[PDB]
Homo-oligomer: A and B are copies of this chain.
Amino acid sequence: PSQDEEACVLAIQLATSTVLPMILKSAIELDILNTISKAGPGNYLSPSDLASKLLMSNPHAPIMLERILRVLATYKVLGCKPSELSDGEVEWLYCWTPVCKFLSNNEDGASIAPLLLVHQDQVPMKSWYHLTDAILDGGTAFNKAYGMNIFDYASQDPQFNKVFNRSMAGHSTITMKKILETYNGFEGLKSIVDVGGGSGATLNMIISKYPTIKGINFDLPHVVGDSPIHPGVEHVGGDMFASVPKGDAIFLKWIFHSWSDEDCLRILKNCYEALADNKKVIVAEFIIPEVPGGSDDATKSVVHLDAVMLAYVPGGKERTEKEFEALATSAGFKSFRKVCCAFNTWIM
């Protein structure tokens, strides 16, 4: 009877698992995580302390926050410790964890929280309701919801544009900062073109460590025209399928997982054409493991991403290392090399 109970309560848990992303979204929107980050390690807050520090006016906000805090503790975003009340009952206090750090809006702009907000946004959320139809009828879930792909939608909705670009910028500020502690590959080159570089955050972090290097942040016009400027980095609006600006190396982070094999090869030809001989194409992506049933957080992340690609973009998919090696090979490249990994992002 013990196996049945473990299996059934897992089923119930999975059936009510929309709670996690939605409670996380609310904790971010209520500034719970930044507030706890402000308190910092080992600084425990009761639900009442947190409503007070947030200056909330709702007399029932403390009990509501308590129930949110309890969700976050179960998913290890927060720790917690008991505090004895006068009448013998126990108050539960909650505290920072390193996870909470990555989900807080660090003044440096580096945060994973905007990534949660783009996926809970009402525009991408509707694509899931057309996924079952996409499988049975063909087509792509997102385009069936909207009659246009996600990038076309962003160009027509400035609010969603900012939400999308901020989620990418937050992630790659964190990731390139840790990448740069272990990657040589930019040291000896005159210039880098970030193809689909979004808001320029990746080059912002590359040039700040290697000034003198000329950064070319290349993306669609509606993305570059709403982006801040770092010195060393010049924004170029364009279309990577039309051409790619020339440089000493080309960089593509989280590009290929959004395009079919045939479209990846079209991007890679324009990259080829844009570089001199004996030059590099630097790719940053997750990699699918050869064995699919792992339950750790790294496998969950890349598996989540592959499902996101399935609903959001035609032909998008996460790939194995052998699948990346094949693309480079088909594109006339002669050397493929997996270099290092940071926060599940490989440099290839």
What is the interface of chain A, defined by CB distance below 8 A to chain B? 1, 3-26, 29-30, 56-61, 64-65, 67-68, 70-71, 73-77, 79-80, 82, 90, 92, 97-99, 101-103, 112-113, 115-116, 119-120, 122, 125, 128-129, 131-132, 134-138, 171, 174, 178, 181, 290-295, 297-301, 303-308, 310-311, 317, 342-344
Contact = CB atoms under 8 A, between A and B. Distances in A.
A128 B317 contact: no
B6 A297 contact: yes
B298 A22 contact: no
B293 A102 contact: no
Contacts of A115: 12, 15-16
8 closest A-B pairs by beta carbon, nearest first, are: A16-B304, A11-B102, A15-B116, A7-B98, A22-B128, A11-B112, A15-B115, A73-B293
Contacts of A290: 90
A301 B9 contact: yes
A74 B19 contact: no
Contact of A13 (B8, B125, B300): B300
Contacts of A178: 1, 4-5, 8
A26 B297 contact: no
- State the majority secondary structure of interface residues on A: helix
A22 B132 CA distance: 10
A233 to B, nearest CB: 24
7 contacts: A9-B298, A9-B344, A12-B112, A14-B21, A14-B116, A18-B18, A23-B131
B17 A74 contact: no
A132 B30 contact: yes
A304 B13 contact: yes
B293 A79 contact: yes
Contacts of A21: 14-15, 17-18
A188 B99 CA distance: 54
B67 A343 contact: no
Given A290-B90, A306-B70, A103 B30 contact: no
B60 A131 contact: no
B30 A136 contact: yes
A104 B23 CA distance: 27
Nearest to A341: B5
Nearest to A99: B7
A74 B303 CA distance: 8
A116 B16 CA distance: 6
A136 B56 contact: yes
A321 to B, nearest CB: 14
Contact of A24 (B14, B23, B300, B343): B14
Given A10-B297, A18-B128, A26-B128, 11 more contacts: A7-B98, A9-B298, A9-B301, A16-B301, A25-B128, A65-B135, A67-B317, A68-B310, A71-B306, A74-B300, A80-B292
Contacts of A73: 292-293
Contact of A12 (B8, B64, B343): B343
Given A58-B136, A295-B75, A7 B304 contact: no
A102 B308 contact: no
